[PDB]
Design an enzyme around this catalytic site. Structure first.
Site, PDB file in Angstrom:
ATOM      1  NE  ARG A 140      23.987  12.423  -9.566  1.00 19.16           N
ATOM      2  CZ  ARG A 140      25.114  13.024  -9.966  1.00 19.16           C
ATOM      3  NH1 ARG A 140      25.559  14.116  -9.344  1.00 19.16           N
ATOM      4  NH2 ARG A 140      25.818  12.520 -10.979  1.00 19.16           N
ATOM      5  CE  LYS A 176      24.524   5.765 -12.213  1.00 23.29           C
ATOM      6  NZ  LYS A 176      24.972   4.973 -11.031  1.00 23.29           N
TER       7      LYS A 176
HETATM    8  C1  LIG Z   1      13.494   9.114 -11.775  1.00 22.87           C
HETATM    9  N1  LIG Z   1      13.707   8.692 -10.367  1.00 22.87           N
HETATM   10  C2  LIG Z   1      12.782   8.411  -9.398  1.00 22.87           C
HETATM   11  C3  LIG Z   1      11.231   8.523  -9.718  1.00 22.87           C
HETATM   12  C4  LIG Z   1      10.218   8.385  -8.498  1.00 22.87           C
HETATM   13  C5  LIG Z   1      10.803   7.767  -7.182  1.00 22.87           C
HETATM   14  C6  LIG Z   1      12.365   7.727  -7.088  1.00 22.87           C
HETATM   15  C7  LIG Z   1      13.274   8.023  -8.110  1.00 22.87           C
HETATM   16  C8  LIG Z   1      14.765   7.893  -7.739  1.00 22.87           C
HETATM   17  O1  LIG Z   1      15.581   6.842  -8.291  1.00 22.87           O
HETATM   18  O2  LIG Z   1      15.227   8.828  -6.853  1.00 22.87           O
HETATM   19  C9  LIG Z   1      16.640   9.010  -6.438  1.00 22.87           C
HETATM   20  C10 LIG Z   1      16.677  10.173  -5.460  1.00 22.87           C
HETATM   21  O3  LIG Z   1      15.859  11.253  -5.915  1.00 22.87           O
HETATM   22  C11 LIG Z   1      16.121   9.532  -4.187  1.00 22.87           C
HETATM   23  N2  LIG Z   1      16.385  10.324  -2.932  1.00 22.87           N
HETATM   24  C12 LIG Z   1      15.424  10.739  -2.076  1.00 22.87           C
HETATM   25  N3  LIG Z   1      15.971  11.429  -1.073  1.00 22.87           N
HETATM   26  C13 LIG Z   1      17.280  11.462  -1.275  1.00 22.87           C
HETATM   27  C14 LIG Z   1      18.385  12.031  -0.592  1.00 22.87           C
HETATM   28  N4  LIG Z   1      18.200  12.718   0.536  1.00 22.87           N
HETATM   29  N5  LIG Z   1      19.718  11.864  -1.124  1.00 22.87           N
HETATM   30  C15 LIG Z   1      19.921  11.135  -2.330  1.00 22.87           C
HETATM   31  N6  LIG Z   1      18.837  10.616  -2.946  1.00 22.87           N
HETATM   32  C16 LIG Z   1      17.559  10.753  -2.469  1.00 22.87           C
HETATM   33  O4  LIG Z   1      16.751   8.218  -4.155  1.00 22.87           O
HETATM   34  C17 LIG Z   1      17.147   7.882  -5.543  1.00 22.87           C
HETATM   35  C18 LIG Z   1      18.671   7.477  -5.514  1.00 22.87           C
HETATM   36  O5  LIG Z   1      19.555   7.877  -6.353  1.00 22.87           O
HETATM   37  P1  LIG Z   1      21.019   7.493  -5.746  1.00 22.87           P
HETATM   38  O6  LIG Z   1      21.878   8.428  -6.667  1.00 22.87           O
HETATM   39  O7  LIG Z   1      21.130   7.723  -4.294  1.00 22.87           O
HETATM   40  O8  LIG Z   1      20.912   5.975  -6.142  1.00 22.87           O
HETATM   41  P2  LIG Z   1      21.817   4.815  -5.636  1.00 22.87           P
HETATM   42  O9  LIG Z   1      21.402   4.949  -4.075  1.00 22.87           O
HETATM   43  O10 LIG Z   1      23.346   4.792  -5.683  1.00 22.87           O
HETATM   44  O11 LIG Z   1      20.896   3.775  -6.301  1.00 22.87           O
HETATM   45  P3  LIG Z   1      21.509   3.132  -7.567  1.00 22.87           P
HETATM   46  O12 LIG Z   1      22.488   1.988  -6.965  1.00 22.87           O
HETATM   47  O13 LIG Z   1      20.430   2.551  -8.407  1.00 22.87           O
HETATM   48  O14 LIG Z   1      22.329   4.262  -8.415  1.00 22.87           O
END
Ligand SMILES: CNc1ccccc1C(=O)O[C@H]1[C@@H](O)[C@H](n2cnc3c(N)ncnc32)O[C@@H]1COP(=O)(O)OP(=O)(O)OP(=O)(O)O
Ligand SMILES: C=C[C@@]1(C)CC(=O)[C@]2(O)[C@@]3(C)[C@@H](O)CCC(C)(C)[C@@H]3[C@H](O)[C@H](OC(=O)CCCCN3CCN(C)CC3)[C@@]2(C)O1
Ligand SMILES: Nc1nc2c(ncn2[C@@H]2O[C@H](COP(=O)(O)OP(=O)(O)OP(O)(O)=S)[C@@H](O)[C@H]2O)c(=O)[nH]1
Ligand SMILES: [Cl-]
Ligand SMILES: [Mn+2]
Ligand SMILES: [Mn+2]
Ligand SMILES: [Mn+2]
Lengths: 188, 330, 189
Positions: A140, A176
């Site tokens: 982020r 977020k």
């Molecule tokens: C406090 N958060 C965590 C504690 C331990 C294990 C995981 C998390 C967690 O939610 O990690 C986020 C990234 O660090 C983790 N992550 C790991 N590798 C990543 C990557 N390469 N790019 C983006 N996110 C990544 O995935 C998560 C996704 O966030 P995203 O903004 O993509 O969520 P969304 O897919 O839109 O889900 P939601 O609909 O609920 O908002």
């Protein structure tokens, strides 16, 4: 296992989503991957250097390089400065590739540190990824950064100064879930 | 047997014109490009008149009367989709007939203008007609900016060729490498004549010195260190006039031409003034000092004095160009 | 020799499935990083299973984004239904009745069909991936699903041979990119 200090770095190229053209000239988007390979690959030629002997390449998200330093251990926070030297590393290369593609790519970065729960996952071909909030932000802090600049958090802002690096406050950006946090930029 | 050719060059070097020469020599609809022709003629004049006040010192007409014909063309410059009325052809032509408009034209280098100017304006009469159908040269003089890359699939002596014209502009060079992979040889293009005009991309860099620095980029490119470039010193006719006339020396733009002597190997075509002979080759050796440095026998440079609008010359050269692809077994 | 090998290979008629744990981060501020990395892994373990059964192939994993294509490597004209049932299984795959995962999670399947370009970029740490505008699209199709009703681009319905029951997803209003290219979105029932 879980670590207590793992410096995570993302290095994306927004400028690529556009350069990627799917035409009958570029063999339908191939000849531009062929150039993106020439980049990523040229970007991996760093991991095999003395300076970045401790730099680990976690993965690659499409047109986004994902590294991390500090996974080979139990100063204590120096590899952070190493990770940055590597941010500066990719840029040196990324810009040079332009010189031969007559292109103009810019690197956008989001470095951070803290506890990451590295490990593998999957039932078929397991993959080594570092989960954790430390990484949540690390991304982020990239997705919302500025080209040619590196966007670091508060603590990272601090540490970097004690290493000889000046930092300017971009302002506030909502990471977020963790809410609105203050980020800084590494004075180039 | 299939060969793929890429044409590179500075801005408006004369690439597409070559690719047109190609259709002409190896490949009715002449009624759909008539438009673009008149649109040239349009710019041609409105650009000249425009830059008459701007230049320093100013270029004033000889027939004050024409002040109103100047206000005419200047009142249509930004007009979208001009319908082309006889009045245009008229006032324009009288403007062309005007001595101060030509005076402004003999200094058409201090301001960006197309090359087909002299040509189109001299045939307003021929163009204005309702039956005006562009001949073959008229379609090789009509200028249009190439935006992207286009593949012309032509055949010669039962051997296929694939031509690739690309944006000669700066904002276009970001698509070349989209074809740098497995392509026979690079036809480079230059405006041996444009040695006296700054580019359009900025209005401060010599077109020629920008063609040199471009050749340098391709020749020394990390993906073209094995690919042979077949440089095309184009617009050899224009170069000459500028040379001969002397209204613009070459050594004031490229001082390195003062200490320059004429070549030995030179094959001076049939009564080509020694002033021209020296010049055109000078402009060859500037590109040659680049192909001499790197390369290291992995790729060589084959120059070609040319005139892209001479379906006669172009064939003589795309033949040598058909030779070297077979000879060097490329 | 001029351009590094680039181990990439075009592949023209396949279905691409994308899934995302709707609302996951919400789950995060409640559970231990460990139980999460576990619940996550747990889920993905059963995923690769439900994956190889419906004859589809999982490409890569990004945190909570698990995307498995179909019709690879060996060409299968069945690509359509594959991703279709993948989502089908994927939906029941979040059976919180036995997965005590905490606050209500759900997938947001987003399928699509088209041509691809798969292989691996770089020379280090290779990871099999897919690249093509169509692939870009299927991602936004994921970013346009509702409560995990399976999204299926009009191109996905043309390979379904009208077998399943879809309804207008009015995609585009949900996601800008779908609207941007005015793509007619549906939803399996
Ligand atoms: C406090 N958060 C965590 C504690 C331990 C294990 C995981 C998390 C967690 O939610 O990690 C986020 C990234 O660090 C983790 N992550 C790991 N590798 C990543 C990557 N390469 N790019 C983006 N996110 C990544 O995935 C998560 C996704 O966030 P995203 O903004 O993509 O969520 P969304 O897919 O839109 O889900 P939601 O609909 O609920 O908002
Ligand atoms: C390589 C060229 C190009 C243009 C084409 C392409 O198909 C991509 O590789 C996809 C689409 C494609 O592989 C689907 C997986 C993934 C990983 C998502 C890629 C990235 O979005 C790329 O761009 C990016 O790096 C930018 C967007 C990344 C943000 N996404 C948002 C959605 N979540 C679920 C994952 C992260 C991509 C778009 O880049
Ligand atoms: N006088 C003269 N004009 C020439 C010659 N070769 C080409 N031209 C003229 O050059 C002008 C520009 O040609 P063009 O083919 O458009 O350049 P380009 O390199 O293709 O540049 P672009 O169009 O991609 S940005 C045309 O009006 C053409 O007739 C030549 O040998 N003599
Ligand atoms: Cl030039
Ligand atoms: Mn052109
Ligand atoms: Mn999610
Ligand atoms: Mn995600």
């Amino acid at each position: 296992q879980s670590y207590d200090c793992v410096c995570v770095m993302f290095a994306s190229i927004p400028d690529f989503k556009e350069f990627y053209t799917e035409s009958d000239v570029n063999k339908e988007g191939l000849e531009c991957l062929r150039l993106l390979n020439e980049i990523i690959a040229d970007f991996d030629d760093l991991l095999s250097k003395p300076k970045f002997s401790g730099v680990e390449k976690i993965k690659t998200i499409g047109s986004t390089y994902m590294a991390a330093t500090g996974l080979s251990a139990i100063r204590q926070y120096m590899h952070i400065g190493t990770m940055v030297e590597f941010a500066y590393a990719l840029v040196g290369k990324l810009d040079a590739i332009n010189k031969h593609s007559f292109n103009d790519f810019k690197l956008r970065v989001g470095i951070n540190h803290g506890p990451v729960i590295a490990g593998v996952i999957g039932a078929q071909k397991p993959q080594y990824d570092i989960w954790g909030n430390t990484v949540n932000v690390a991304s982020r802090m990239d997705s919302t950064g500025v080209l040619d600049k590196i966007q670091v958090t508060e603590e990272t802002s601090l540490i970097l100064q004690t290493l000889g690096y000046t930092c300017t406050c971009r302002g506030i950006i909502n990471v977020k879930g963790k809410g609105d946090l203050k980020t800084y930029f590494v004075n180039t | 047997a299939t060969h793929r050719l890429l044409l590179l060059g500075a801005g408006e070097s004369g690439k597409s014109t070559i690719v047109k020469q190609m259709r002409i020599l190896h490949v009715g609809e002449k009624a759909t490009k008539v438009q673009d022709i008149k649109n040239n003629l349009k710019e041609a004049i409105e650009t000249i008149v425009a830059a008459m006040s701007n230049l320093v010192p100013p270029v004033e007409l000889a027939n004050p009367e024409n002040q109103f014909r100047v206000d005419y063309i200047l009142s249509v410059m930004n007009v979208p989709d001009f319908d082309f009325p006889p009045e245009f052809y008229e006032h324009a032509k009288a403007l062309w007939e005007d001595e101060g408009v030509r005076a402004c034209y003999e200094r058409s280098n201090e301001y960006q203008l197309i090359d087909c100017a002299q040509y189109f304006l001299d045939k307003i009469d021929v163009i204005k007609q309702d039956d005006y159908v562009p001949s073959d040269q008229d379609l090789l003089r009509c200028r249009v900016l190439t935006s992207g890359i286009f593949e012309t699939k032509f055949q010669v002596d039962k051997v296929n060729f694939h031509m690739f014209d690309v944006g000669g502009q700066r904002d276009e060079r970001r698509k070349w490498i989209q074809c740098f992979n497995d392509v026979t040889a690079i036809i480079f293009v230059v405006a041996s004549s444009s040695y006296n005009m700054v580019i359009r991309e900025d209005n401060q860099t010599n077109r020629l010195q920008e063609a040199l620095n471009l050749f340098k980029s391709i020749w020394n490119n990390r993906w073209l260190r094995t690919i042979s470039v077949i440089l095309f010193l184009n617009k050899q006719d224009l170069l000459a006039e500028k040379v001969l006339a002397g209204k613009s020396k070459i050594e004031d733009y490229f001082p390195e031409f003062a200490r320059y002597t004429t070549p030995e190997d030179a094959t001076p075509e049939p009564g080509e003034d020694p002033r021209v002979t020296r010049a055109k080759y000078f402009i060859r050796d500037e590109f040659l000092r680049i192909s001499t440095a790197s390369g290291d026998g992995r790729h060589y440079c084959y120059p070609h004095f040319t005139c892209a609008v001479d379906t006669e010359n172009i064939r003589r050269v795309f033949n040598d160009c058909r030779d070297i692809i077979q000879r060097m077994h490329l | 020799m001029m351009f590094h090998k680039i181990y990439i290979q075009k592949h023209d008629n396949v279905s691409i499935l994308f899934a995302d744990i709707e609302g996951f981060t919400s789950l995060a501020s409640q559970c231990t990083a460990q139980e999460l990395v576990m619940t996550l892994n747990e889920l993905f373990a059963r995923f690769d299973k439900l994956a190889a059964e419906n004859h589809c192939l999982r490409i890569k994993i990004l945190g909570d984004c698990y995307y498995c294509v179909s019709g690879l490597p060996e060409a299968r004209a069945d690509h359509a239904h594959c991703c279709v049932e993948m989502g089908m299984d994927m939906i029941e795959a979040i059976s919180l009745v036995r997965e005590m995962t905490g606050v209500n999670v759900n997938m947001r399947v987003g399928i699509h069909s088209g041509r691809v370009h798969c292989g691996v970029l770089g020379l280090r740490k290779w990871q099999f991936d897919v690249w093509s505008n169509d692939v870009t699209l299927a991602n936004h199709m994921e970013a346009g699903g509702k409560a995990g009703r399976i999204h299926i681009t009009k191109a996905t319905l043309s390979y379904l041979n009208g077998d399943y029951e879809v309804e207008p997803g009015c995609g585009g209003e949900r996601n800008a990119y779908l609207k941007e290219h005015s793509i007619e979105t549906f939803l399996i029932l």
